[PDB]
Design an enzyme around this catalytic site. Structure first.
Site, PDB file in Angstrom:
ATOM      1  N   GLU A  35      39.431  39.178  30.065  1.00 45.52           N
ATOM      2  CA  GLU A  35      38.043  38.906  30.471  1.00 45.52           C
ATOM      3  C   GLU A  35      37.226  38.270  29.351  1.00 45.52           C
ATOM      4  O   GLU A  35      36.449  37.336  29.595  1.00 45.52           O
ATOM      5  CB  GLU A  35      37.361  40.201  30.891  1.00 45.52           C
ATOM      6  CG  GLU A  35      37.867  40.755  32.208  1.00 45.52           C
ATOM      7  CD  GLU A  35      37.604  39.951  33.452  1.00 45.52           C
ATOM      8  OE1 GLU A  35      37.008  38.892  33.370  1.00 45.52           O
ATOM      9  OE2 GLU A  35      38.071  40.442  34.529  1.00 45.52           O
ATOM     10  N   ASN A  46      29.260  32.066  37.180  1.00 49.44           N
ATOM     11  CA  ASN A  46      30.037  31.940  38.409  1.00 49.44           C
ATOM     12  C   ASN A  46      29.448  30.860  39.299  1.00 49.44           C
ATOM     13  O   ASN A  46      28.267  30.563  39.197  1.00 49.44           O
ATOM     14  CB  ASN A  46      30.110  33.275  39.139  1.00 49.44           C
ATOM     15  CG  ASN A  46      30.623  34.400  38.270  1.00 49.44           C
ATOM     16  OD1 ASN A  46      30.049  35.501  38.214  1.00 49.44           O
ATOM     17  ND2 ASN A  46      31.743  34.101  37.666  1.00 49.44           N
ATOM     18  N   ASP A  48      28.725  30.975  42.308  1.00 44.89           N
ATOM     19  CA  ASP A  48      27.716  31.565  43.168  1.00 44.89           C
ATOM     20  C   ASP A  48      26.384  31.775  42.446  1.00 44.89           C
ATOM     21  O   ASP A  48      25.494  32.338  43.094  1.00 44.89           O
ATOM     22  CB  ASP A  48      28.194  32.850  43.834  1.00 44.89           C
ATOM     23  CG  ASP A  48      28.323  34.093  42.963  1.00 44.89           C
ATOM     24  OD1 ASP A  48      28.090  33.977  41.725  1.00 44.89           O
ATOM     25  OD2 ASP A  48      28.614  35.174  43.488  1.00 44.89           O
ATOM     26  N   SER A  50      25.786  33.884  39.925  1.00 42.20           N
ATOM     27  CA  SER A  50      25.821  35.125  39.157  1.00 42.20           C
ATOM     28  C   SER A  50      26.459  34.795  37.796  1.00 42.20           C
ATOM     29  O   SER A  50      26.999  33.731  37.596  1.00 42.20           O
ATOM     30  CB  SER A  50      26.603  36.248  39.855  1.00 42.20           C
ATOM     31  OG  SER A  50      27.970  35.921  40.020  1.00 42.20           O
ATOM     32  N   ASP A  52      28.782  36.826  34.561  1.00 37.52           N
ATOM     33  CA  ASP A  52      29.571  37.939  34.046  1.00 37.52           C
ATOM     34  C   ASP A  52      29.236  38.156  32.569  1.00 37.52           C
ATOM     35  O   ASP A  52      29.180  37.187  31.811  1.00 37.52           O
ATOM     36  CB  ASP A  52      31.055  37.665  34.172  1.00 37.52           C
ATOM     37  CG  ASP A  52      31.604  37.487  35.576  1.00 37.52           C
ATOM     38  OD1 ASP A  52      30.925  37.883  36.512  1.00 37.52           O
ATOM     39  OD2 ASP A  52      32.717  36.950  35.692  1.00 37.52           O
ATOM     40  N   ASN A  59      29.554  41.685  36.482  1.00 40.62           N
ATOM     41  CA  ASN A  59      28.883  40.659  37.234  1.00 40.62           C
ATOM     42  C   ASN A  59      27.479  41.090  37.630  1.00 40.62           C
ATOM     43  O   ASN A  59      27.284  42.212  38.096  1.00 40.62           O
ATOM     44  CB  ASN A  59      29.775  40.297  38.416  1.00 40.62           C
ATOM     45  CG  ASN A  59      29.329  39.095  39.179  1.00 40.62           C
ATOM     46  OD1 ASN A  59      28.687  39.238  40.223  1.00 40.62           O
ATOM     47  ND2 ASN A  59      29.650  37.921  38.670  1.00 40.62           N
ATOM     48  N   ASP A 101      34.397  52.262  42.956  1.00 37.21           N
ATOM     49  CA  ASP A 101      33.718  51.703  44.110  1.00 37.21           C
ATOM     50  C   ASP A 101      34.649  51.588  45.313  1.00 37.21           C
ATOM     51  O   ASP A 101      34.156  51.334  46.419  1.00 37.21           O
ATOM     52  CB  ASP A 101      33.081  50.354  43.794  1.00 37.21           C
ATOM     53  CG  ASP A 101      32.177  49.735  44.860  1.00 37.21           C
ATOM     54  OD1 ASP A 101      31.239  50.405  45.289  1.00 37.21           O
ATOM     55  OD2 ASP A 101      32.397  48.569  45.229  1.00 37.21           O
TER      56      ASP A 101
END
Length: 129
Positions: A35, A46, A48, A50, A52, A59, A101
């Protein structure tokens, strides 16, 4: 901060990630490697919109607030900047929520694509733990 491999293994263990949700320490070290290359200041945008953040590339779409991710949540109740600290407490605490989650470490696509199924114990080989 750019952690050493065994340095980060030790810190993750001290903060209770070893076997957290059943994931041995090597899984976490491997995820951090791919990562962030063990760099707490890593950030990546990202498609979209967003971003990280930090050693585990957490995120802004769900977990932290950066003020520029429309429609997103802040389920870890932190500013995303907290995930860039030399102190990994916020990143660890938030990762514990993420991995709880429902999908385990598959939340980290890099873990799924580069760590899952591999000899993750190699990532802690040789470390004083």
């Amino acid at each position: 901060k750019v952690f050493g491999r065994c340095e980060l293994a030790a810190a993750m263990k001290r903060h209770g990630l070893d076997n957290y949700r059943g994931y041995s320490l090597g899984n976490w070290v491997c995820a951090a490697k791919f990562e962030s290359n063990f760099n707490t200041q890593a950030t990546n945008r990202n498609t979209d919109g967003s971003t990280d953040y930090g050693i585990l590339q957490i995120n802004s779409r769900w977990w932290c607030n950066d003020g520029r991710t429309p429609g997103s949540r802040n389920l870890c109740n932190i500013p995303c900047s907290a995930l860039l600290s030399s102190d990994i407490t916020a990143s660890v605490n938030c990762a514990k929520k993420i991995v709880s989650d429902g999908n385990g470490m598959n939340a980290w696509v890099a873990w799924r694509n580069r760590c899952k199924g591999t000899d993750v114990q190699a990532w802690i080989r040789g470390c004083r733990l």
